[PDB]
Ligand binder design. Sequence first.
Ligand SMILES: NC(=O)c1ccc[n+]([C@@H]2O[C@H](COP(=O)([O-])OP(=O)(O)OC[C@H]3O[C@@H](n4cnc5c(N)ncnc54)[C@H](O)[C@@H]3O)[C@@H](O)[C@H]2O)c1
Ligand SMILES: NC(=O)c1ccc[n+]([C@@H]2O[C@H](COP(=O)([O-])OP(=O)(O)OC[C@H]3O[C@@H](n4cnc5c(N)ncnc54)[C@H](O)[C@@H]3O)[C@@H](O)[C@H]2O)c1
Ligand code: NA
Ligand code: NA
Ligand code: NA
Ligand code: NA
Lengths: 487, 488, 488, 487
Amino acid sequence: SHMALLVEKTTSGREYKVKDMSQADFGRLEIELAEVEMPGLMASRSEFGPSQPFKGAKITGSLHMTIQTAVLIETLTALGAEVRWCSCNIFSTQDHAAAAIARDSAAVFAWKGETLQEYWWCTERALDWGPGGGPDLIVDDGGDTTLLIHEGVKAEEIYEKSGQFPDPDSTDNAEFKIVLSIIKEGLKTDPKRYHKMKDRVVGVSEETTTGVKRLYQMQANGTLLFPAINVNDSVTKSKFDNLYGCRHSLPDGLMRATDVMIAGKVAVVAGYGDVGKGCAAALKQAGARVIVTEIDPICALQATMEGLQVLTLEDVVSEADIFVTTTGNKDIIMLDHMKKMKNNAIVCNIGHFDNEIDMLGLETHPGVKRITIKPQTDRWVFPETNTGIIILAEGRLMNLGCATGHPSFVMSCSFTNQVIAQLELWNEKSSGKYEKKVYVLPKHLDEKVAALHLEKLGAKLTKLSKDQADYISVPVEGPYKPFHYRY
Amino acid sequence: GSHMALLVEKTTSGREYKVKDMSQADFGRLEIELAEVEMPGLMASRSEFGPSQPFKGAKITGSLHMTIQTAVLIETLTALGAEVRWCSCNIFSTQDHAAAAIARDSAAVFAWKGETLQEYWWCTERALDWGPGGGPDLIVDDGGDTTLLIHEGVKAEEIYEKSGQFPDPDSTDNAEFKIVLSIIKEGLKTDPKRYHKMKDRVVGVSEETTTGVKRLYQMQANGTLLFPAINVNDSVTKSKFDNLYGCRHSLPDGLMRATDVMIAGKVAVVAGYGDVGKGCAAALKQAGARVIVTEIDPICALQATMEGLQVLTLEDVVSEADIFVTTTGNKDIIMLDHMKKMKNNAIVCNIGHFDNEIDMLGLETHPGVKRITIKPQTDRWVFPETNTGIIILAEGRLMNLGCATGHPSFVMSCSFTNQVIAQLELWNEKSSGKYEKKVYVLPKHLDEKVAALHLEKLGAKLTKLSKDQADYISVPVEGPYKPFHYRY
Amino acid sequence: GSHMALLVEKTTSGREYKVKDMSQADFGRLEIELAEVEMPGLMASRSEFGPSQPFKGAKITGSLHMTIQTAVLIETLTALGAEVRWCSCNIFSTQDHAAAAIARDSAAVFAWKGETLQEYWWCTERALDWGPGGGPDLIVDDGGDTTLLIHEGVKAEEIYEKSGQFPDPDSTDNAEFKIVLSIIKEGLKTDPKRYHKMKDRVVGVSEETTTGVKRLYQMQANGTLLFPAINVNDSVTKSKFDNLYGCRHSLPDGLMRATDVMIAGKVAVVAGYGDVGKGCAAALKQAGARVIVTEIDPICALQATMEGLQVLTLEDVVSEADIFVTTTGNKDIIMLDHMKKMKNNAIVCNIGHFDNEIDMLGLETHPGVKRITIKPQTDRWVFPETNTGIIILAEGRLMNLGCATGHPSFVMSCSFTNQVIAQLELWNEKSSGKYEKKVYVLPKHLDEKVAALHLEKLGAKLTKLSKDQADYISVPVEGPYKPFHYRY
Amino acid sequence: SHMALLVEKTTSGREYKVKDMSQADFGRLEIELAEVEMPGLMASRSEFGPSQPFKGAKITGSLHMTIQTAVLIETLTALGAEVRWCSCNIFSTQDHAAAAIARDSAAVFAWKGETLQEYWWCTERALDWGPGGGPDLIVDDGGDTTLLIHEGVKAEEIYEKSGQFPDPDSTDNAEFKIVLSIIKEGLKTDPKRYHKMKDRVVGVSEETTTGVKRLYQMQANGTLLFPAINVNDSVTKSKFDNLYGCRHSLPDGLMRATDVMIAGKVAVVAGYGDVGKGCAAALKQAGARVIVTEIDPICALQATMEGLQVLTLEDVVSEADIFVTTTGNKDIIMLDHMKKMKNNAIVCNIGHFDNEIDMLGLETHPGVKRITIKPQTDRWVFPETNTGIIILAEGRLMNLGCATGHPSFVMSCSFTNQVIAQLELWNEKSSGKYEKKVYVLPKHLDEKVAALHLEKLGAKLTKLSKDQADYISVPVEGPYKPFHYRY
Ligand SMILES: NC(=O)c1ccc[n+]([C@@H]2O[C@H](COP(=O)([O-])OP(=O)(O)OC[C@H]3O[C@@H](n4cnc5c(N)ncnc54)[C@H](O)[C@@H]3O)[C@@H](O)[C@H]2O)c1
Ligand SMILES: NC(=O)c1ccc[n+]([C@@H]2O[C@H](COP(=O)([O-])OP(=O)(O)OC[C@H]3O[C@@H](n4cnc5c(N)ncnc54)[C@H](O)[C@@H]3O)[C@@H](O)[C@H]2O)c1
Ligand code: NA
Ligand code: NA
Ligand code: NA
Ligand code: NA
């Protein structure tokens, strides 16, 4: 890397670190377009702008630094917030979005193609509100910022007693060694950094399935330090972004990274949850023959109902042309599988982290060679066979890494939920309404998010008469469905 | 009694029935034997539970539509030891050959295709009336009419106990409810504590469908619900399969049998976009129609638009569309005023509930209108103003069951394995604590079991989590695999 | 003659017929009246050409399947002045109510659902035999059996003229051809120059389907074709609509009526991927089956793969698949050897041609096999080796027409407006030059007219080229719009 | 432009002009991938390599200078040809493909973002075989090289008699003024350039519908100077490339250029021929509600059968979000239409030239303003309304201009037909088999193209028995369909 890990500042004194500030004008042009595609965000600015509900608030966000996220940030700032941000993936930043935000609106520490050390430095920077303290609020995607704070508190409690430091030797996970080393270094400067932080944090709102999994784990073990709102599981997030967003951005990533024809191919989708449903839909609708793997018999049965074959990976590894992992689990596509794939099979992950595909096993395979075709398209050649596979985005989120992730309209659904969650936490900061638990937004607000997006599309809703509303036992104004309704 | 009185017949062994034609039993058996192969969950239930006879001594009254699929369910209950009496929950949904085979071989059945409402309610009363040994212990219901009769019967019996007063159909202007009050009145002459006994003995009801479950929550909210209920509809393996994929199959089947109309190239309106509407819209669009959805729920409307469907109000499209399908579970969707604007030979049907999604009452009384029956369950109503018609299917009642055969066996095996599980759970807790006078759903592990029992038939090969992987996603190797509030 | 002799009946006015049940005429009329609305091309043909009576004096024999759709075609021919006699070209395809309404109201008809082959050929002979005034002038054929009878009849008459020898069914081992030779033999006793007269007078034949057109080219190549032929199948508005979208409709309809099987979740094999196979595969995949295609043509195979369908040989999939559909127009696609490998209750059907895509002969003679009829046109053949069955639809004959109602009216209006146009063209050139003893297709401007006549019904609004735009793409404003070899 | 219109030369003396030669290594990496996706081309190299059928031949091609075309060029050269090339569109060149070819294989005059003067200069250069003469063979796409030769001959015949030059004032078409001026300049150096050329040209093979239209016009008016093979109308070209290729590359162009969500939108496809069918399929399968316009009642009826609404443009102009022209005709989307479109409606052309969309009217609208978002995405703002539209690739082919055009696999079908057509013309150069008319390849070769692509996809063909072949009256080895079969 040529990056020097020293913050820069705007003329006004606001910190940042981005690839290229000269891209700000281009960022602004695309943000202007995105705004039109994001009516829920823009409506939120109109509704809440006058009252400046986030005046005086300090918000840290660790969410992919895209054009979409720029619109979200500029909604928080339109509402009065001061904001610091980082990306939650080393390849997901759109550098022009980051530049525009750094120039005009918020402190940003993000660039496309970070190293893992840089990633974690940016995370620290986004949390670093200086001696006065902060953040008041956190917007998280995947849970890494939340993780750092919780791990930090734990380390601080040990250090305070015995003077023991985290030891990277205690983990075999190369990235978690980084984390432990950063926590150690922080103890050596301020051994109560995270204590002070957690005592000020009003809450976190979490974007994605994997992050929410991490939250429920912390709830269950009594370690969660502050309230959390699960944004993922709003209906208007999970059943839109995860599904329709990947239906858009999976083929976009494939096409940009490889230009491969999807029609006529065999594609394997590991998992058939919301993401796998959307990926399988895209591949099928592009003319691929899609094979699904699953552990959940209900999801497997759904896939069969949709005309998809359900097999185990071992039955199709030498046949398939394209492999997509969507599971949120580890150890889906191992080195042993990769070695059996046809020459130039495309292997990618749209789920989580770097461990759905066995990138560790690949990189450490004796005699393997990596040929970079272009950024985020790598061909790995095996010495036994002298054939190769194509790995996208080093096994990290392929849609954001190889293309631009989901489009604005669907991200407006997700991010209107984020605004609503942040407003709820902040408005209730002094009320005691929320405990140190995980909450979801109520149905009437989930419905409001949908309703805010109808006019853009020309969708005309019918109004119940009072008689009709009574007949199905709902209010005229909703909510319209029972608590456990699945849509 | 009356020349035209409805009277039960009896098999050689004395078991009561009333069906269209007992000579259709052999045909019924032939199609049941095919259905069994298509219903692995039910057959697996027979293999697993048959030897232990878990329903020994239990009496079950059911009202699931008297189809070939229901026949396999009935014969699973009897394989498990139950004694069964049955009726259909719709006047047009019985498959007469299914009813005959069951009547001959397995259970008392009071059902035929083309009942009147008077006949319908008589059949329901008969399915309930077990004679001096009492019963039922268990109820399987679809839409809640059996449950309603019991609750209304208790109320009438209370009044009778206090004052000796009988119900009086003159007290209501609801044509159907007049029939119900009449049934109860005449029933007090034979056994004025029928329903009180029943509600001391009934263990619970398991309810098939969305509208029936609405009715159960209304009774729970008002404190009138008399016994526990399991909401089978809201198992994932019911709602997300039957309501969705079932209708995807049976909607076009009903249209094609009733009318033979080409769906391709048409404009079709689907009112509602819940599970049934989603499946109907899918079928229509799959077949080459251009589908327009109406909705009241902004989430469902946004879903439709994501799927490439136009969302409008009915008024916007009523003069243009060729096919109209109501899926709402609500009233007053397609009114006479709408019908008067429709083109010649627009097809109008209901796959949701009852007879009131389409304004059949308003149609009946429209001045100068003429109903011309094309064939059973296809009727062309001619508007005098224009000398044009609309084609109403199944008199505005469930078109899939009324004009075709309803859902296919495989998906009904999913629904009905949930029914068997529900029945077993209610009975196995007959003397327990676990179920109060409230509505319950089956637990996720059993929902997953239902799906798992259907995979082999389709050749679907499931992956097994390693222990390490199961821990990584915080689930047990054996499931359940998803959080409580997962939506699939 | 024989106790069981087939004898014609006569209407009050003396017109001959033989149908299942004349009492079904009113029902037939009701459904014809609905079909008319769905068949704008035919109704427009009546409006345009009715007053000029272009078929005055013409006698037309037809064999298009005797459906409600065909009824609208017949009544278009009669509206234009023709006298008509008709039979069905399949033993299972007649809709008896359609046949009765036509027999009552419009034309001599010899057709019922469930004919024997002996009855089939008798009906064909009757549709041809006009009595002393002679006829037909024109033939409408589907599959070529009527055309074949005439050609075989001429040959027999030649032999008879030369030597007085009659055909002898002993001369052939082909069971069906024995029947044909018998018909001709007995026909020489009544009119030994029937077919010679016919082939001096017949103006031409218009042929509906791919296999019939194959037969016509074989006769043209060998120099035996006796009169002009118009290949209606290969109008774009026939092949690319009926064969494709028609089957997309009528394949699933046949499956659902015959078996009620859930298509979703199954594996379905479609043998062939021409127009019919494309439409069948589309329906199956639309319905949620996983479709595997077999093909001999690499172009068609590549098309299937582009559409996300697996292409394999039958042998690769015979033990796994749930549904098999032959679409080829070829012989010996699904042999007994294949059938013996199929799973219990695999469904096996033919939508292509004749009775020889599936090896029904081999099935019949398989040692120990047992045919169990479930209901008409659904038969379960039980293999003794495994005590498992296969479900054969319509005895291996066209399953869509045999198990359901064939294509719907709208798409048949496209096909049948081409038939009317073909008939008009042959007749209007009755004394001309234009048509020799060869196969012709209709010109593109008429193909376009057929489509144009169907747009209004669907609300499709066509753009008009400016003069400048028409010149830019080198077409006339009024069309034709595409080059001769355009494939659509 | 910063381009200097002077040829460069390789070390070996071969001429070229490309954007950036340093991109050759990257070009080569992607060509290596494409080869695997192009089995028909690679099989052609294996079959015909030994015999070197194009040894001694000089081939000019004017076909989009993509990675796909690079594989085609390198098949011609593997077979012995010496090659000169240009792109047939100002935005379709992939600069890394051009560089690799310029370095390794053939003279290339092509770059992404040419001006029209540069485009025509490159065309001249690709035809310029120096004093020895050439080309022997032409590969054309859209007919511009063919046009230049025919117009040139005509001008030469006039000039030879009266000394009259072409006069650009005789056309109001800005681009045809360029052409006439280049012909005039050429008369002033060699007044028999095109005569000599045409007397040596063995034939042309033409890629696309519009080009074939131009050929049939020249046939019909007796002006066609040499044999032509219509490659477009091979079944394995028209019903694959035009259909499935656009089903891939239309959404790719939209997504790269705009990142707009297609799902939930209304999209208008003008035309429903092969290209419009493929575009409508893509849009529908992505979740857009597609409205088709058509002049051909058969095509309109097909669209209705597929569940698409057929209307005139005027009925939907203010509703639709995305407009795609596929017609090969002019004056589809006029200025008057554009002025009625909603803010940020996307307008693009995947058919031909620059006149499906009224780019002239737009550019000359008083007070209009153009804002370039990024190359090939332009927002035009109207003064009456102060709202804008988004024009892709300046109204030129959007798939090639905004993305990378069709993928390799389908282009292997098209380009195997091109190889076969060139081999036919060249092998028959001295035989008199071909007249000055337009031919199509025979069915057995069309079938061979398909068959060459089956193994890649795992498609297993059934073999007819002799009895079966007889039954349907075809040979065991084909061809399998009648002459007029439409597939
Ligand atoms: N890249 C993006 O833009 C994007 C969008 C949304 C969510 N996500 C991420 O995608 C992942 C999936 O999210 P989701 O909402 O679909 O979750 P989900 O829980 O709905 O679906 C995951 C599915 O994977 C299955 N599965 C688990 N282990 C498996 C294994 N070993 N083999 C096969 N199947 C297995 C599960 O049964 C489940 O159905 C999460 O990591 C989430 O954070 C990414
Ligand atoms: N960009 C690409 O990669 C690509 C791929 C193949 C072909 N092409 C080009 O695409 C264009 C279309 O090719 P095609 O093969 O589909 O041609 P086609 O002739 O099959 O289809 C064009 C259609 O446009 C219709 N049409 C003509 N004028 C119209 C008007 N005013 N309004 C509406 N419809 C109108 C015609 O009726 C016709 O059906 C041609 O210019 C061709 O060269 C481009
Ligand atoms: Na994006
Ligand atoms: Na059914
Ligand atoms: Na029909
Ligand atoms: Na490309």
